[PDB]
């Protein structure tokens, strides 16, 4: 319990889960909504994936 | 530059980029041409290749 020649400086991060409030005024962004499209990704003989 | 007792015959190949005139007579072959088939290969959601 004797002091060495140097002194340290601890640095740490503290993760904090926080409920936020998001605001955005009207007429903020314009959007284009496209029609959905379906296609087979992996045509397994047991079960077709879509 | 003394001529030795043996004679030599050099042989070299010369590759030549030529042009060829092709002929055929009237009604040489008979092209049976069928109607082509169409197969959608890539069912991509951006542009489809047939």
From Swiss-Prot, chains A, B:
It is found in: Virion; Host nucleus. It comes from the Viruses. Belongs to the herpesviridae major capsid protein family. Homomultimer. Makes the hexons and eleven out of twelve pentons. Interacts with triplex proteins 1/TRX1 and 2/TRX2; adjacent capsomers are linked together in groups of three by triplexes, heterotrimeric complexes composed of one molecule of TRX1 and two molecules of TRX2. Interacts with scaffold protein; this interaction allows efficient MCP transport to the host nucleus. Interacts with capsid vertex component 2/CVC2. Interacts with the small capsomere-interacting protein/SCP. Self-assembles to form an icosahedral capsid with a T=16 symmetry, about 200 nm in diameter, and consisting of 150 hexons and 12 pentons (total of 162 capsomers). Hexons form the edges and faces of the capsid and are each composed of six MCP molecules. In contrast, one penton is found at each of the 12 vertices. Eleven of the pentons are MCP pentamers, while the last vertex is occupied by the portal complex. This is Major capsid protein. It comes from Epstein-Barr virus (strain B95-8) (HHV-4). The chain holds residues 1037 to 1086 of 1381 of the full protein.
């Amino acid at each position: 319990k004797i002091h060495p020649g140097v002194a340290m400086t601890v640095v740490r991060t503290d993760e904090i889960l926080s409920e936020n409030i998001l605001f955005s005024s009207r007429a903020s962004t314009s959007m284009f909504i496209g029609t959905p499209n379906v296609s087979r990704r992996e045509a397994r003989v047991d079960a077709v994936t879509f």
